[PDB]
Design a protein around this ligand. Structure first.
Ligand SMILES: O=c1[nH]c(=O)c2nn[nH]c2[nH]1
Ligand SMILES: O=c1[nH]c(=O)c2nn[nH]c2[nH]1
Ligand SMILES: O=c1[nH]c(=O)c2nn[nH]c2[nH]1
Ligand SMILES: O=c1[nH]c(=O)c2nn[nH]c2[nH]1
Ligand SMILES: O=c1[nH]c(=O)c2nn[nH]c2[nH]1
Ligand SMILES: O=c1[nH]c(=O)c2nn[nH]c2[nH]1
Ligand SMILES: O=c1[nH]c(=O)c2nn[nH]c2[nH]1
Ligand SMILES: O=c1[nH]c(=O)c2nn[nH]c2[nH]1
Ligand code: NA
Ligand code: NA
Ligand code: NA
Ligand code: NA
Lengths: 295, 295, 295, 295
């Protein structure tokens, strides 16, 4: 037998950083969870018990905290590039670094219609993520994403015209609830290295905001023919609004809310056009996925 | 042996209700999870296999959906009172109904600075809850609450002056992070019945908003001596702003963020007044609880 | 306003202890999560910012580890009594200690039909818990429990004869699946203090084993008329097998598995006596509770 | 823009099946959660609102239940092959089916040392999974796996000899705790189709049992130089014991248990060779991965 692939490192590293502007008195906090896995010439640690090739996972943990001490942590696309470059440049036998970051929301509080200078709230379990693959001689690949954006529209969604056969019982509808947890990922053109990543820094926060904006606007306004159709439209617009993206990927659960027929009780009318009370279903759920790129 | 206490019913009943205003075109959604447990003369179902005393849990589920069909679901303090009264009035052998409701956030979306008429977002896993105990011959007890309000302030919290002995290693501090998940419960004066609950309806939403407001304002502004001291202040104000509350109860985790000493690496300065990078701790956590009422 | 009730301390303290028998070479591990909350004369910390009354939560954490260093951690009913007594005896202003322990399973591995001396497996997320309330001048109250015992029987459960009215749609059945997560709690007679708790030590592990045994045996063998009826029988037997218990309490979800009617597809027969394929329901769920004590 | 990749279907389909042997009276239950995603000529549903290409997710759900009605559900490698083949054979425009199954443990109860004929227990949250990719003109790829096998050994693990530099603070050790959640995946040689999958049926359950056996035996007995070294050994043996596997893949968290130095309290000795009491760490965690195949 032989090692065909190996990676190792440190996962679930929780990291908080504060920035204190001494002139203005205002403080800004950043919280994230980091995973760094390394590849390179490490097979002998698996096959021969040779630990001389191991940058200890503990040491990778120490490095994350140092790196966040010495550099900005925002945008995450930059922090990740810096962190991954560090490992491949610092260690000759390590040839790739894989960095994953989840950014947790700490939004500034409004207290009598005024931004408080050092108090924050988790206004949503929605995350901003990055996946950074820094590979020696191959540059820096970044996939940015948002996930856990949970939305629901109470009308202007339809699902009619779908295949029917001896497995089909679903009725066509011209009016239903649509609800989903939005997972949107946009993959950047390969960057030559850290210098190039630095050069595009302002695009990162801006493109995130755009993807979020486009997603919610299109979800809200599209008279959705299908989850398929509505996600295509989102993906299309993100590509059209930022040249440096090669692909946009959506993964959308269809979180079903079922009609409850209450006519068996005193002829109570709660279906079709009388539908007020619904049963949200925890499972199963439709899962719809689409990767869109450039013609 | 003998049955000293028994209750039974249906838990985790997910319920969605839509309200469609046909004049304005605007739709409002309400989502909640309901638990109804009943007590009364039911011991024989346990001891004799006599099911004639069981209002089936399935039937309790059916009743929740019907009741939400026939009445408002908001405020939850009312829906719960209606639902619990139903069971004790409808069934002679059932003498108490316990209703618990968790309200999930579906906030209306802003789409180009304008409230969209039928699109919504889960902007926080924060819940609004009620606990309604409708007891035959004893009226209606309501405990309202908010939970899962996650906050953090990066300075203006201190913890100094605490007992020190041979078990103590914690250092006094005049500047630390304070972060918590706020659980605040306010218990209403016993209501005589449903008529009385209806009479106070406008107080329910208003007092919820107040508790939330007071909590975030005081968390933000208090130069906190301790979590103890800061929660007392919140509780005090909620009582002072609403006469119908008998007690206010806070339960606050202290979610510790530890300093990371990086001086072992190139004399890097990250402690005391140089503290920028912190390690959020997942466990253990301080847990602080206080019930405040009227002198 | 005034403090009517207060408690504080440290929650989620993960604790591992190893015992190494040097003669036999065999090692035994114990893992648990501990919560200690204290009450006493502590109101001034809430109302006056007086921290001199606070045994720091950090220090309570340190104390748990020390106490586990200096005493057995098993049975948990003893460890908890020792830990709670410590705080009320050590500190004059602290008058109650509340100790909660969850014991995690680390079962010894069989490796070629022989107990390995130092390797272990988590064979079930089932927990053994205690709740110990050590109150100055009032002795030591212990509630022991097991929770997360997940079971299912594919036949010999019935539910017929229950109230029917205009809210009822559930059909009577003489053959159904019954599945539950068993939560069983047994409350000991108040102990005078630690000496008394020590005196009964062998009863703790033995009574736990009994409750577990009785639960699974009765769940398996009873031709259950109802969840109510089956739980009563368990509770009865636990009381009858141990004199020092005053009450036994069961809390049982009814985790419904629904028949799937497939006759709409090629007359496929999957209901009643032809029922092979079922849909496990994640929610809602019946919740059934009973406290049994002595005539 | 253009669709580069698309898949859709139904996720989280909970499925229970009972087998009743009428001669012996004995009943056997199988529970699983299924995901089926389809690919093929479906782009027009995304780009043109053409739903005529959609086998409704609801219908895929119906199909899973039917298929489990008409065929065995065990081994999962077979059920998945049957289910995926169904979709590509039944529908001309659908060219791949991706089937994922998680099998939940329902182990038969021992009641007075005898297998009860219809009562079961969830003895571990450990899962058996499959990933089946049935692709038109490309046969059937199966990845089998076990996950959530949580183990711990209290000694006979070491970690010494690893790179040290200005990022390193971890001390070498010749005696530590090792604990992990084992994720082991073994990938079968591509099968020509369902006939071929049927031909190897007995290998599936047998190879699962082997992987489990090898894992626990090697975890227990290896005097582990590193998690790397210990996992390599497991993977090696699985390949050596079954010719039809092309690769074995392990993913192992290192779930750290930290020494607690208690010498600051009365010179208490709890480090090195005196280590009895440890702090299990919830995060961060080392994550170690290795794919092994044939020379
Ligand atoms: O087994 C281990 N492998 C590693 O790579 C490592 N790094 N720190 N600790 C470790 N333990
Ligand atoms: O209300 C429902 N809508 C559906 O589409 C469906 N499919 N199975 N059951 C259902 N109930
Ligand atoms: O065992 C049961 N007890 C109940 O009270 C009930 N209600 N519906 N189904 C039920 N099953
Ligand atoms: O940074 C820390 N602060 C604390 O209060 C503490 N207590 N134990 N370890 C600790 N680390
Ligand atoms: O606010 C706090 N209250 C406390 O009781 C405590 N104990 N350690 N740290 C603390 N912080
Ligand atoms: O199969 C079912 N059994 C039930 O008891 C039930 N109640 N609502 N729907 C149901 N489906
Ligand atoms: O938007 C939808 N897309 C689908 O593919 C589907 N299948 N059933 N319901 C559905 N809704
Ligand atoms: O006990 C510890 N062991 C370790 O390896 C380590 N690394 N950081 N802190 C630590 N504590
Ligand atoms: Na390198
Ligand atoms: Na009544
Ligand atoms: Na005392
Ligand atoms: Na096909």
């Amino acid at each position: 037998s032989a090692v065909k692939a190996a990676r190792y490192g440190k996962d679930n590293v929780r990291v908080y950083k504060v920035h204190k502007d001494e002139k203005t008195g205002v403080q800004t906090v950043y919280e994230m969870t980091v995973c760094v896995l390394l590849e390179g010439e490490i097979e002998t640690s698996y096959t021969k018990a040779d630990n001389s090739v191991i940058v200890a996972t503990d040491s990778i943990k120490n490095t994350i905290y140092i790196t966040a001490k010495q550099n900005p942590v925002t945008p995450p696309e930059l922090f990740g590039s810096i962190l991954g470059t560090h490992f491949i440049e610092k260690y000759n036998h390590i040839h790739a670094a894989h960095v994953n970051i989840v950014c947790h929301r700490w939004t500034r509080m409004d207290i009598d219609g005024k931004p408080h200078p050092h108090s924050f709230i988790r206004d949503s379990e929605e995350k901003r993520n990055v996946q950074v693959d820094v590979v020696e001689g191959k540059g820096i690949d970044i996939k940015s994403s948002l996930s856990g954006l949970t939305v629901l529209k109470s009308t202007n969604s339809q699902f009619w015209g779908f295949l029917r056969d001896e497995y089909t019982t679903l009725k066509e509808t011209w009016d239903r609830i649509l609800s989903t947890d939005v997972d949107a990922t946009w993959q950047w053109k390969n960057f030559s290295g850290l210098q190039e990543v630095r050069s595009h820094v302002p695009k990162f926060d801006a493109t995130w905001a755009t993807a979020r904006e486009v997603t919610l606007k299109t979800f809200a306004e599209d008279n959705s023919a299908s989850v398929q159709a509505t996600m295509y439209k989102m993906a299309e617009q993100i590509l059209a609004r930022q040249q440096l993206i090669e692909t946009v990927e959506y993964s959308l659960p269809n979180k079903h809310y079922f009609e409850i027929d209450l006519s068996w009780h005193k002829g109570l009318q709660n279906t079709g056009k009388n539908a007020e009370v619904f049963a949200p279903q925890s499972d199963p759920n439709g899962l719809i996925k689409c990767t869109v790129g450039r013609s």
